[PDB]
Write an enzyme that holds these catalytic residues in place. Structure first.
Site, PDB file in Angstrom:
ATOM      1  N   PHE A   3      17.756  36.757  25.681  1.00 60.90           N
ATOM      2  CA  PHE A   3      19.403  36.704  26.224  1.00 60.90           C
ATOM      3  C   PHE A   3      20.332  36.394  24.915  1.00 60.90           C
ATOM      4  O   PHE A   3      21.531  37.067  25.145  1.00 60.90           O
ATOM      5  CB  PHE A   3      19.728  35.466  27.341  1.00 60.90           C
ATOM      6  CG  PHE A   3      19.240  36.021  28.685  1.00 60.90           C
ATOM      7  CD1 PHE A   3      17.838  36.590  28.921  1.00 60.90           C
ATOM      8  CD2 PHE A   3      19.906  35.803  29.689  1.00 60.90           C
ATOM      9  CE1 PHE A   3      17.452  36.858  30.265  1.00 60.90           C
ATOM     10  CE2 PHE A   3      19.562  36.234  30.835  1.00 60.90           C
ATOM     11  CZ  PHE A   3      18.433  36.768  31.245  1.00 60.90           C
ATOM     12  N   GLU A  52      24.997  25.152  30.081  1.00 60.91           N
ATOM     13  CA  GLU A  52      24.797  24.542  31.352  1.00 60.91           C
ATOM     14  C   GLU A  52      25.795  23.315  31.560  1.00 60.91           C
ATOM     15  O   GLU A  52      25.785  22.700  32.688  1.00 60.91           O
ATOM     16  CB  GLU A  52      23.195  23.886  31.225  1.00 60.91           C
ATOM     17  CG  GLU A  52      22.100  25.085  31.186  1.00 60.91           C
ATOM     18  CD  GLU A  52      21.993  25.885  30.241  1.00 60.91           C
ATOM     19  OE1 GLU A  52      22.215  25.557  28.935  1.00 60.91           O
ATOM     20  OE2 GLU A  52      21.602  27.287  30.306  1.00 60.91           O
ATOM     21  N   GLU A  73      24.097  37.745  23.736  1.00 56.64           N
ATOM     22  CA  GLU A  73      25.003  36.689  22.985  1.00 56.64           C
ATOM     23  C   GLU A  73      25.505  37.301  21.487  1.00 56.64           C
ATOM     24  O   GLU A  73      26.922  37.350  21.280  1.00 56.64           O
ATOM     25  CB  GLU A  73      24.443  35.252  23.034  1.00 56.64           C
ATOM     26  CG  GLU A  73      23.987  34.772  24.207  1.00 56.64           C
ATOM     27  CD  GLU A  73      23.182  33.305  24.498  1.00 56.64           C
ATOM     28  OE1 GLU A  73      22.517  33.232  23.534  1.00 56.64           O
ATOM     29  OE2 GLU A  73      23.361  32.379  25.723  1.00 56.64           O
TER      30      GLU A  73
HETATM   31  O1  PYF Z   1      18.382  28.293  36.538  1.00 62.22           O
HETATM   32  C1  PYF Z   1      19.140  27.843  35.877  1.00 62.22           C
HETATM   33  C2  PYF Z   1      19.197  28.772  34.349  1.00 62.22           C
HETATM   34  C3  PYF Z   1      18.544  29.943  34.085  1.00 62.22           C
HETATM   35  C4  PYF Z   1      18.850  30.506  32.750  1.00 62.22           C
HETATM   36  C5  PYF Z   1      19.563  29.922  31.637  1.00 62.22           C
HETATM   37  N1  PYF Z   1      20.120  29.017  31.939  1.00 62.22           N
HETATM   38  C6  PYF Z   1      20.097  28.266  33.169  1.00 62.22           C
END
Ligand code: PYF
Ligand code: PYF
Lengths: 251, 251
Positions: free
Chosen positions: B174, B98, B179
Protein backbone atom coordinates in the site's frame (compact mmCIF):
# COMPACT_ATOMS: atom_id res chain seq x y z
CA UNK A 1 -16.13 24.47 33.56
CA UNK A 2 -17.58 23.55 30.17
CA UNK A 3 -19.49 20.22 30.12
CA UNK A 4 -19.22 17.56 27.33
CA UNK A 5 -21.72 18.38 24.50
CA UNK A 6 -24.38 15.82 23.46
CA UNK A 7 -23.62 13.69 26.55
CA UNK A 8 -26.34 11.09 25.78
CA UNK A 9 -25.09 10.65 22.15
CA UNK A 10 -21.45 10.24 23.26
CA UNK A 11 -22.48 7.78 25.98
CA UNK A 12 -24.63 5.62 23.68
CA UNK A 13 -22.00 5.84 20.90
CA UNK A 14 -19.09 4.66 23.12
CA UNK A 15 -21.38 1.98 24.61
CA UNK A 16 -22.27 0.46 21.22
CA UNK A 17 -18.65 0.76 19.98
CA UNK A 18 -17.47 -1.07 23.15
CA UNK A 19 -20.22 -3.77 22.93
CA UNK A 20 -19.45 -4.83 19.37
CA UNK A 21 -15.70 -4.12 19.06
CA UNK A 22 -13.62 -3.48 22.22
CA UNK A 23 -11.83 -5.92 24.57
CA UNK A 24 -13.75 -8.77 22.86
CA UNK A 25 -11.42 -11.48 24.06
CA UNK A 26 -10.42 -9.71 27.28
CA UNK A 27 -13.56 -8.68 29.18
CA UNK A 28 -17.07 -10.15 29.14
CA UNK A 29 -20.09 -8.31 27.59
CA UNK A 30 -22.61 -6.55 29.85
CA UNK A 31 -26.21 -7.99 29.80
CA UNK A 32 -28.11 -4.62 30.01
CA UNK A 33 -28.51 -2.83 26.70
CA UNK A 34 -27.03 0.64 26.15
CA UNK A 35 -30.40 2.43 26.52
CA UNK A 36 -31.03 0.69 29.86
CA UNK A 37 -27.52 1.74 31.08
CA UNK A 38 -28.20 5.35 29.99
CA UNK A 39 -31.51 5.47 31.93
CA UNK A 40 -29.75 4.22 35.08
CA UNK A 41 -26.75 6.67 34.68
CA UNK A 42 -29.08 9.61 34.02
CA UNK A 43 -31.37 8.80 37.04
CA UNK A 44 -28.29 8.83 39.34
CA UNK A 45 -27.40 12.49 38.88
CA UNK A 46 -30.26 14.32 37.11
CA UNK A 47 -32.54 16.72 38.99
CA UNK A 48 -30.04 17.06 41.89
CA UNK A 49 -27.63 19.83 42.92
CA UNK A 50 -24.14 18.44 42.25
CA UNK A 51 -23.09 19.21 45.81
CA UNK A 52 -25.81 16.81 47.04
CA UNK A 53 -24.37 13.70 45.39
CA UNK A 54 -22.84 10.97 47.56
CA UNK A 55 -21.19 7.58 47.35
CA UNK A 56 -24.53 5.84 46.86
CA UNK A 57 -25.85 8.03 44.04
CA UNK A 58 -24.45 5.87 41.24
CA UNK A 59 -24.70 2.50 43.07
CA UNK A 60 -27.49 1.05 40.86
CA UNK A 61 -25.78 2.11 37.60
CA UNK A 62 -22.55 0.40 38.63
CA UNK A 63 -24.43 -2.75 39.67
CA UNK A 64 -25.84 -2.92 36.13
CA UNK A 65 -22.56 -2.03 34.40
CA UNK A 66 -20.14 -4.21 36.44
CA UNK A 67 -18.19 -6.93 34.58
CA UNK A 68 -16.46 -9.91 36.15
CA UNK A 69 -12.70 -9.24 35.88
CA UNK A 70 -9.98 -11.66 34.82
CA UNK A 71 -7.89 -13.34 37.52
CA UNK A 72 -4.51 -11.73 38.42
CA UNK A 73 -4.87 -8.91 35.90
CA UNK A 74 -6.29 -5.91 37.76
CA UNK A 75 -4.11 -2.84 38.17
CA UNK A 76 -4.57 0.22 40.44
CA UNK A 77 -2.43 3.36 40.20
CA UNK A 78 -1.66 6.69 41.96
CA UNK A 79 0.14 9.70 40.50
CA UNK A 80 1.35 7.88 37.38
CA UNK A 81 -1.68 7.79 35.01
CA UNK A 82 0.22 7.91 31.76
CA UNK A 83 2.94 5.40 32.60
CA UNK A 84 0.50 2.88 34.19
CA UNK A 85 -1.75 2.96 31.15
CA UNK A 86 1.09 2.62 28.65
CA UNK A 87 2.41 -0.36 30.60
CA UNK A 88 -1.16 -1.98 30.94
CA UNK A 89 -1.38 -1.81 27.16
CA UNK A 90 -5.17 -1.67 26.43
CA UNK A 91 -6.02 -4.71 28.42
CA UNK A 92 -3.27 -6.93 26.97
CA UNK A 93 -0.94 -6.89 29.98
CA UNK A 94 -3.14 -5.53 32.79
CA UNK A 95 -6.77 -4.31 33.06
CA UNK A 96 -7.35 -0.74 34.35
CA UNK A 97 -10.67 0.85 35.33
CA UNK A 98 -10.57 2.79 32.08
CA UNK A 99 -10.80 -0.52 30.10
CA UNK A 100 -14.01 -1.58 31.80
CA UNK A 101 -17.39 -0.53 30.30
CA UNK A 102 -18.30 2.29 32.72
CA UNK A 103 -14.67 3.53 32.81
CA UNK A 104 -14.48 3.63 29.00
CA UNK A 105 -17.89 5.31 28.57
CA UNK A 106 -17.22 8.17 30.95
CA UNK A 107 -13.42 8.58 30.63
CA UNK A 108 -12.49 12.30 30.37
CA UNK A 109 -16.13 13.47 30.17
CA UNK A 110 -17.60 16.26 32.23
CA UNK A 111 -21.25 16.46 33.28
CA UNK A 112 -23.60 17.96 35.94
CA UNK A 113 -27.18 17.75 37.06
CA UNK A 114 -29.32 20.76 38.09
CA UNK A 115 -32.66 21.12 39.88
CA UNK A 116 -34.45 22.82 36.97
CA UNK A 117 -35.64 21.12 33.77
CA UNK A 118 -34.27 19.27 31.92
CA UNK A 119 -32.35 18.23 35.05
CA UNK A 120 -28.76 18.63 33.73
CA UNK A 121 -26.80 21.44 32.06
CA UNK A 122 -25.02 20.92 28.72
CA UNK A 123 -23.52 24.43 28.63
CA UNK A 124 -22.02 25.29 32.01
CA UNK A 125 -21.33 23.60 35.27
CA UNK A 126 -20.22 25.01 38.60
CA UNK A 127 -16.59 24.30 39.51
CA UNK A 128 -16.71 21.18 41.64
CA UNK A 129 -13.97 22.23 44.12
CA UNK A 130 -16.78 24.14 45.76
CA UNK A 131 -18.53 20.84 46.66
CA UNK A 132 -18.02 18.51 49.63
CA UNK A 133 -15.59 15.60 49.14
CA UNK A 134 -18.19 12.79 49.01
CA UNK A 135 -19.92 14.59 46.12
CA UNK A 136 -16.75 15.42 44.28
CA UNK A 137 -15.85 11.76 44.50
CA UNK A 138 -19.36 10.36 43.96
CA UNK A 139 -18.81 8.90 40.52
CA UNK A 140 -15.17 7.80 40.29
CA UNK A 141 -15.13 6.81 43.98
CA UNK A 142 -18.13 4.46 43.50
CA UNK A 143 -16.43 3.35 40.20
CA UNK A 144 -13.26 2.35 42.08
CA UNK A 145 -15.15 0.52 44.87
CA UNK A 146 -17.14 -1.56 42.43
CA UNK A 147 -14.05 -2.36 40.27
CA UNK A 148 -11.86 -3.20 43.31
CA UNK A 149 -14.64 -5.40 44.78
CA UNK A 150 -14.53 -7.50 41.58
CA UNK A 151 -10.78 -8.22 41.66
CA UNK A 152 -9.41 -11.79 42.15
CA UNK A 153 -5.95 -13.29 42.37
CA UNK A 154 -2.94 -10.94 42.46
CA UNK A 155 -3.55 -7.19 42.07
CA UNK A 156 -0.96 -4.63 41.05
CA UNK A 157 -0.49 -1.11 42.34
CA UNK A 158 1.77 1.38 40.48
CA UNK A 159 2.95 4.47 42.49
CA UNK A 160 5.13 7.58 42.02
CA UNK A 161 8.34 7.39 44.04
CA UNK A 162 9.91 10.75 43.01
CA UNK A 163 7.36 13.31 44.24
CA UNK A 164 8.61 15.21 47.29
CA UNK A 165 5.21 16.73 47.97
CA UNK A 166 3.01 13.61 47.60
CA UNK A 167 3.90 10.33 49.37
CA UNK A 168 3.65 7.08 47.37
CA UNK A 169 0.85 5.79 49.54
CA UNK A 170 -1.69 8.08 51.31
CA UNK A 171 -4.84 7.01 53.20
CA UNK A 172 -6.89 9.85 51.68
CA UNK A 173 -6.23 8.83 48.06
CA UNK A 174 -8.73 6.81 46.00
CA UNK A 175 -6.61 3.80 46.53
CA UNK A 176 -6.67 4.32 50.30
CA UNK A 177 -10.37 5.12 50.67
CA UNK A 178 -11.99 3.07 47.92
CA UNK A 179 -9.88 0.33 46.51
CA UNK A 180 -7.81 -1.28 49.29
CA UNK A 181 -10.80 -1.45 51.75
CA UNK A 182 -12.90 -3.20 49.11
CA UNK A 183 -10.46 -6.01 48.15
CA UNK A 184 -12.20 -9.33 49.06
CA UNK A 185 -10.79 -12.65 50.19
CA UNK A 186 -10.66 -13.74 46.52
CA UNK A 187 -7.58 -11.41 46.28
CA UNK A 188 -4.31 -13.11 47.36
CA UNK A 189 -1.52 -10.58 46.98
CA UNK A 190 -0.83 -6.84 46.40
CA UNK A 191 2.20 -6.23 44.13
CA UNK A 192 3.60 -2.68 44.24
CA UNK A 193 5.66 -1.06 41.44
CA UNK A 194 7.42 2.15 42.52
CA UNK A 195 8.16 4.42 39.55
CA UNK A 196 11.30 6.60 39.80
CA UNK A 197 11.12 9.25 37.03
CA UNK A 198 14.25 9.67 34.91
CA UNK A 199 16.43 12.54 35.98
CA UNK A 200 14.50 13.32 39.16
CA UNK A 201 15.69 12.77 42.74
CA UNK A 202 14.61 9.43 44.26
CA UNK A 203 12.15 10.01 47.13
CA UNK A 204 10.41 6.76 48.21
CA UNK A 205 11.90 3.28 48.34
CA UNK A 206 10.38 -0.05 49.29
CA UNK A 207 10.45 -0.98 52.97
CA UNK A 208 10.54 2.68 54.15
CA UNK A 209 8.28 5.67 54.70
CA UNK A 210 4.74 5.42 53.37
CA UNK A 211 5.56 2.18 51.61
CA UNK A 212 6.36 0.48 54.93
CA UNK A 213 2.96 1.74 56.24
CA UNK A 214 1.26 0.24 53.14
CA UNK A 215 3.05 -3.11 53.69
CA UNK A 216 1.78 -3.29 57.30
CA UNK A 217 -1.82 -2.51 56.27
CA UNK A 218 -1.83 -5.07 53.47
CA UNK A 219 -0.43 -7.79 55.77
CA UNK A 220 -2.98 -6.86 58.50
CA UNK A 221 -5.64 -7.76 55.92
CA UNK A 222 -3.98 -11.14 55.30
CA UNK A 223 -2.82 -10.40 51.73
CA UNK A 224 0.66 -11.34 50.59
CA UNK A 225 2.87 -8.30 49.70
CA UNK A 226 5.81 -7.41 47.44
CA UNK A 227 7.45 -4.33 45.99
CA UNK A 228 9.88 -3.46 43.18
CA UNK A 229 11.52 -0.15 42.07
CA UNK A 230 11.76 0.56 38.29
CA UNK A 231 11.59 -3.13 37.16
CA UNK A 232 13.22 -3.52 33.71
CA UNK A 233 10.07 -3.55 31.56
CA UNK A 234 8.86 -0.43 33.22
CA UNK A 235 12.34 1.23 32.99
CA UNK A 236 12.48 0.49 29.23
CA UNK A 237 9.09 2.12 28.80
CA UNK A 238 10.39 5.25 30.58
CA UNK A 239 13.58 5.21 28.49
CA UNK A 240 11.60 5.29 25.26
CA UNK A 241 10.42 8.82 26.16
CA UNK A 242 13.94 10.01 27.24
CA UNK A 243 16.54 7.81 25.49
CA UNK A 244 19.54 9.93 26.48
CA UNK A 245 18.83 9.95 30.21
CA UNK A 246 21.75 8.62 32.20
CA UNK A 247 19.70 5.76 33.69
CA UNK A 248 19.12 4.45 30.10
CA UNK A 249 22.68 3.80 29.02
CA UNK A 250 22.95 0.46 27.22
CA UNK A 251 26.07 -1.68 27.23
CA UNK B 1 -15.29 -14.14 6.64
CA UNK B 2 -17.78 -12.78 9.24
CA UNK B 3 -19.28 -9.33 8.81
CA UNK B 4 -19.29 -6.90 11.73
CA UNK B 5 -22.69 -6.85 13.41
CA UNK B 6 -24.82 -3.71 13.48
CA UNK B 7 -22.41 -1.96 11.03
CA UNK B 8 -24.41 1.28 10.77
CA UNK B 9 -24.75 1.54 14.62
CA UNK B 10 -21.00 0.99 15.09
CA UNK B 11 -20.05 3.42 12.29
CA UNK B 12 -22.30 6.20 13.70
CA UNK B 13 -21.28 5.53 17.32
CA UNK B 14 -17.56 5.79 16.55
CA UNK B 15 -18.20 8.84 14.40
CA UNK B 16 -19.94 10.78 17.22
CA UNK B 17 -17.37 9.64 19.79
CA UNK B 18 -14.54 10.86 17.54
CA UNK B 19 -16.24 14.17 16.67
CA UNK B 20 -16.83 15.29 20.28
CA UNK B 21 -13.93 13.68 22.18
CA UNK B 22 -10.96 12.34 20.13
CA UNK B 23 -7.71 13.96 18.94
CA UNK B 24 -9.07 17.39 19.82
CA UNK B 25 -5.64 19.04 20.15
CA UNK B 26 -3.95 17.38 17.14
CA UNK B 27 -6.50 16.93 14.27
CA UNK B 28 -9.26 19.28 13.00
CA UNK B 29 -12.92 18.24 12.88
CA UNK B 30 -14.47 17.54 9.51
CA UNK B 31 -17.42 19.56 8.35
CA UNK B 32 -19.87 16.81 7.41
CA UNK B 33 -22.18 15.36 10.08
CA UNK B 34 -22.13 11.59 10.82
CA UNK B 35 -25.35 10.77 8.91
CA UNK B 36 -23.98 12.46 5.71
CA UNK B 37 -20.71 10.49 6.05
CA UNK B 38 -22.76 7.25 6.51
CA UNK B 39 -24.71 7.98 3.32
CA UNK B 40 -21.43 8.43 1.35
CA UNK B 41 -19.79 5.35 2.82
CA UNK B 42 -22.89 3.18 2.22
CA UNK B 43 -23.48 4.16 -1.41
CA UNK B 44 -19.87 3.22 -2.27
CA UNK B 45 -20.64 -0.49 -1.91
CA UNK B 46 -24.38 -1.06 -1.41
CA UNK B 47 -26.72 -2.89 -3.84
CA UNK B 48 -23.83 -4.21 -5.91
CA UNK B 49 -22.15 -7.61 -6.00
CA UNK B 50 -19.48 -7.96 -3.26
CA UNK B 51 -16.62 -7.75 -5.79
CA UNK B 52 -17.84 -4.81 -7.92
CA UNK B 53 -15.54 -2.07 -6.58
CA UNK B 54 -12.48 -0.07 -7.74
CA UNK B 55 -10.20 2.75 -6.49
CA UNK B 56 -12.92 5.27 -7.24
CA UNK B 57 -15.82 3.60 -5.36
CA UNK B 58 -15.35 5.40 -2.02
CA UNK B 59 -14.30 8.67 -3.65
CA UNK B 60 -17.10 10.84 -2.11
CA UNK B 61 -16.64 9.38 1.38
CA UNK B 62 -12.93 10.11 1.46
CA UNK B 63 -13.33 13.63 0.11
CA UNK B 64 -15.87 14.45 2.81
CA UNK B 65 -13.84 12.69 5.61
CA UNK B 66 -10.35 14.19 4.92
CA UNK B 67 -8.63 16.30 7.56
CA UNK B 68 -5.56 18.62 7.23
CA UNK B 69 -2.63 16.77 8.89
CA UNK B 70 0.08 18.16 11.26
CA UNK B 71 3.31 19.14 9.55
CA UNK B 72 6.25 16.76 10.20
CA UNK B 73 4.08 14.25 12.06
CA UNK B 74 2.67 11.90 9.45
CA UNK B 75 3.82 8.30 9.74
CA UNK B 76 3.34 5.45 7.27
CA UNK B 77 4.03 1.79 8.09
CA UNK B 78 4.45 -1.68 6.47
CA UNK B 79 4.36 -5.08 8.27
CA UNK B 80 4.71 -3.65 11.78
CA UNK B 81 1.22 -2.66 12.93
CA UNK B 82 1.72 -3.01 16.67
CA UNK B 83 5.23 -1.51 16.80
CA UNK B 84 4.32 1.56 14.70
CA UNK B 85 1.13 2.35 16.59
CA UNK B 86 2.80 1.82 19.96
CA UNK B 87 5.61 4.15 18.85
CA UNK B 88 3.36 6.86 17.36
CA UNK B 89 1.50 6.78 20.68
CA UNK B 90 -2.06 7.68 19.47
CA UNK B 91 -1.06 10.96 17.87
CA UNK B 92 1.46 11.97 20.59
CA UNK B 93 4.71 11.66 18.62
CA UNK B 94 3.18 10.82 15.21
CA UNK B 95 -0.24 10.48 13.56
CA UNK B 96 -1.07 7.15 11.75
CA UNK B 97 -3.92 6.50 9.31
CA UNK B 98 -5.89 4.77 12.08
CA UNK B 99 -5.91 8.05 14.14
CA UNK B 100 -7.68 10.00 11.35
CA UNK B 101 -11.52 10.01 11.23
CA UNK B 102 -12.03 7.46 8.41
CA UNK B 103 -9.29 5.17 9.75
CA UNK B 104 -10.65 5.30 13.40
CA UNK B 105 -14.18 4.59 12.13
CA UNK B 106 -13.58 1.51 10.00
CA UNK B 107 -10.43 0.02 11.66
CA UNK B 108 -11.02 -3.77 12.04
CA UNK B 109 -14.52 -3.76 10.65
CA UNK B 110 -15.69 -6.20 7.95
CA UNK B 111 -18.46 -5.43 5.44
CA UNK B 112 -19.73 -6.08 1.86
CA UNK B 113 -22.50 -5.35 -0.57
CA UNK B 114 -25.06 -7.62 -2.32
CA UNK B 115 -27.63 -6.75 -5.01
CA UNK B 116 -30.73 -7.91 -3.13
CA UNK B 117 -32.26 -5.85 -0.31
CA UNK B 118 -30.93 -4.59 2.22
CA UNK B 119 -27.97 -4.05 -0.16
CA UNK B 120 -25.31 -5.42 2.20
CA UNK B 121 -24.72 -8.94 3.39
CA UNK B 122 -25.20 -9.44 7.12
CA UNK B 123 -24.13 -13.08 7.06
CA UNK B 124 -20.99 -13.59 5.01
CA UNK B 125 -18.32 -11.65 3.08
CA UNK B 126 -15.95 -13.03 0.39
CA UNK B 127 -12.47 -14.23 1.07
CA UNK B 128 -11.45 -11.06 -0.81
CA UNK B 129 -9.05 -13.52 -2.40
CA UNK B 130 -12.12 -14.27 -4.48
CA UNK B 131 -12.32 -10.59 -5.54
CA UNK B 132 -9.92 -8.92 -8.00
CA UNK B 133 -7.16 -6.66 -6.64
CA UNK B 134 -8.70 -3.24 -7.46
CA UNK B 135 -11.80 -4.35 -5.43
CA UNK B 136 -9.97 -5.97 -2.55
CA UNK B 137 -7.99 -2.70 -2.06
CA UNK B 138 -10.78 -0.28 -2.93
CA UNK B 139 -11.38 1.16 0.58
CA UNK B 140 -7.97 1.09 2.26
CA UNK B 141 -6.23 1.95 -1.04
CA UNK B 142 -8.28 5.14 -1.38
CA UNK B 143 -7.82 5.86 2.41
CA UNK B 144 -3.99 5.70 2.00
CA UNK B 145 -4.03 7.74 -1.23
CA UNK B 146 -6.07 10.52 0.41
CA UNK B 147 -3.94 10.42 3.55
CA UNK B 148 -0.59 10.66 1.68
CA UNK B 149 -1.83 13.56 -0.44
CA UNK B 150 -2.42 15.61 2.75
CA UNK B 151 0.99 15.01 4.36
CA UNK B 152 3.40 17.94 4.79
CA UNK B 153 7.04 18.52 5.82
CA UNK B 154 9.03 15.45 6.96
CA UNK B 155 7.15 12.09 6.75
CA UNK B 156 8.23 8.91 8.54
CA UNK B 157 8.00 5.30 7.23
CA UNK B 158 8.44 2.27 9.55
CA UNK B 159 9.11 -1.07 7.87
CA UNK B 160 10.02 -4.66 8.83
CA UNK B 161 13.69 -5.43 8.23
CA UNK B 162 13.39 -9.09 9.55
CA UNK B 163 10.90 -10.78 7.27
CA UNK B 164 12.65 -13.20 4.92
CA UNK B 165 9.48 -13.62 2.81
CA UNK B 166 8.72 -9.92 2.31
CA UNK B 167 11.21 -7.09 1.54
CA UNK B 168 11.19 -3.85 3.62
CA UNK B 169 9.98 -1.90 0.55
CA UNK B 170 7.73 -3.39 -2.18
CA UNK B 171 6.28 -1.44 -5.11
CA UNK B 172 2.95 -3.33 -4.75
CA UNK B 173 2.51 -2.66 -0.99
CA UNK B 174 0.00 0.00 0.00
CA UNK B 175 2.89 2.39 0.70
CA UNK B 176 4.47 1.69 -2.71
CA UNK B 177 1.29 1.61 -4.76
CA UNK B 178 -0.77 4.33 -3.03
CA UNK B 179 1.32 6.44 -0.71
CA UNK B 180 4.82 7.28 -2.11
CA UNK B 181 3.12 8.13 -5.46
CA UNK B 182 0.80 10.65 -3.80
CA UNK B 183 3.37 12.61 -1.72
CA UNK B 184 3.33 16.24 -2.90
CA UNK B 185 5.91 19.04 -3.24
CA UNK B 186 4.97 19.96 0.31
CA UNK B 187 6.81 16.92 1.65
CA UNK B 188 10.49 17.65 2.05
CA UNK B 189 12.04 14.49 3.50
CA UNK B 190 11.19 10.78 3.89
CA UNK B 191 12.66 9.34 7.11
CA UNK B 192 12.82 5.56 7.15
CA UNK B 193 12.93 3.54 10.43
CA UNK B 194 13.92 -0.10 9.85
CA UNK B 195 12.67 -2.45 12.48
CA UNK B 196 14.98 -5.33 13.42
CA UNK B 197 12.89 -7.69 15.54
CA UNK B 198 14.55 -8.88 18.77
CA UNK B 199 16.15 -12.31 18.60
CA UNK B 200 15.65 -12.55 14.83
CA UNK B 201 17.98 -12.55 11.82
CA UNK B 202 18.46 -9.21 10.10
CA UNK B 203 17.15 -9.37 6.54
CA UNK B 204 17.27 -5.76 5.34
CA UNK B 205 19.71 -2.93 6.16
CA UNK B 206 19.85 0.75 5.27
CA UNK B 207 21.94 1.49 2.20
CA UNK B 208 21.25 -1.87 0.59
CA UNK B 209 18.63 -4.00 -1.24
CA UNK B 210 15.02 -2.80 -1.48
CA UNK B 211 15.94 0.14 0.75
CA UNK B 212 18.41 1.36 -1.84
CA UNK B 213 15.65 1.20 -4.46
CA UNK B 214 13.42 3.21 -2.12
CA UNK B 215 16.16 5.87 -1.70
CA UNK B 216 16.48 6.19 -5.47
CA UNK B 217 12.68 6.73 -5.75
CA UNK B 218 12.56 9.28 -2.96
CA UNK B 219 15.47 11.35 -4.43
CA UNK B 220 13.89 11.43 -7.92
CA UNK B 221 10.95 13.26 -6.30
CA UNK B 222 13.49 15.69 -4.96
CA UNK B 223 12.95 14.82 -1.28
CA UNK B 224 15.79 14.35 1.23
CA UNK B 225 16.24 10.81 2.60
CA UNK B 226 17.60 9.24 5.73
CA UNK B 227 17.31 5.76 7.14
CA UNK B 228 18.05 4.36 10.61
CA UNK B 229 17.71 0.86 12.05
CA UNK B 230 16.34 0.33 15.60
CA UNK B 231 16.75 3.95 16.75
CA UNK B 232 16.94 4.07 20.59
CA UNK B 233 13.35 5.18 21.21
CA UNK B 234 12.03 2.21 19.18
CA UNK B 235 14.48 -0.31 20.64
CA UNK B 236 13.37 0.56 24.19
CA UNK B 237 9.74 -0.11 23.22
CA UNK B 238 10.73 -3.53 21.80
CA UNK B 239 12.73 -4.25 24.99
CA UNK B 240 9.83 -3.27 27.25
CA UNK B 241 7.86 -6.21 25.88
CA UNK B 242 10.83 -8.58 26.02
CA UNK B 243 13.20 -7.28 28.73
CA UNK B 244 15.47 -10.34 28.78
CA UNK B 245 16.51 -10.04 25.10
CA UNK B 246 20.25 -9.67 24.43
CA UNK B 247 19.87 -6.42 22.49
CA UNK B 248 18.55 -4.92 25.74
CA UNK B 249 21.62 -5.48 27.95
CA UNK B 250 22.41 -2.54 30.24
CA UNK B 251 25.77 -0.92 31.08
O1 PYF C 1 -9.14 -3.12 9.08
C1 PYF C 1 -8.49 -2.18 9.40
C2 PYF C 1 -7.23 -1.73 8.52
C3 PYF C 1 -6.83 -2.46 7.33
C4 PYF C 1 -5.76 -2.10 6.52
C5 PYF C 1 -4.99 -0.98 6.86
N1 PYF C 1 -5.30 -0.24 8.00
C6 PYF C 1 -6.41 -0.60 8.83
O1 PYF D 1 -12.09 11.52 33.60
C1 PYF D 1 -11.74 10.37 33.50
C2 PYF D 1 -11.23 9.60 34.78
C3 PYF D 1 -11.15 10.24 36.08
C4 PYF D 1 -10.72 9.60 37.25
C5 PYF D 1 -10.33 8.26 37.19
N1 PYF D 1 -10.37 7.57 35.98
C6 PYF D 1 -10.82 8.22 34.78
Amino acid sequence: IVPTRELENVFLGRCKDYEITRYLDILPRVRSDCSALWKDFFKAFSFKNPCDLDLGSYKDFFTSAQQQLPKNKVMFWSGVYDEAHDYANTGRKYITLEDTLPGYMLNSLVWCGQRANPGFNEKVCPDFKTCPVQARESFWGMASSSYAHSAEGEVTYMVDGSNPKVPAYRPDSFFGKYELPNLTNKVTRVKVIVLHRLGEKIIEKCGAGSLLDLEKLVKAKHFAFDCVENPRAVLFLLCSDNPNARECRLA
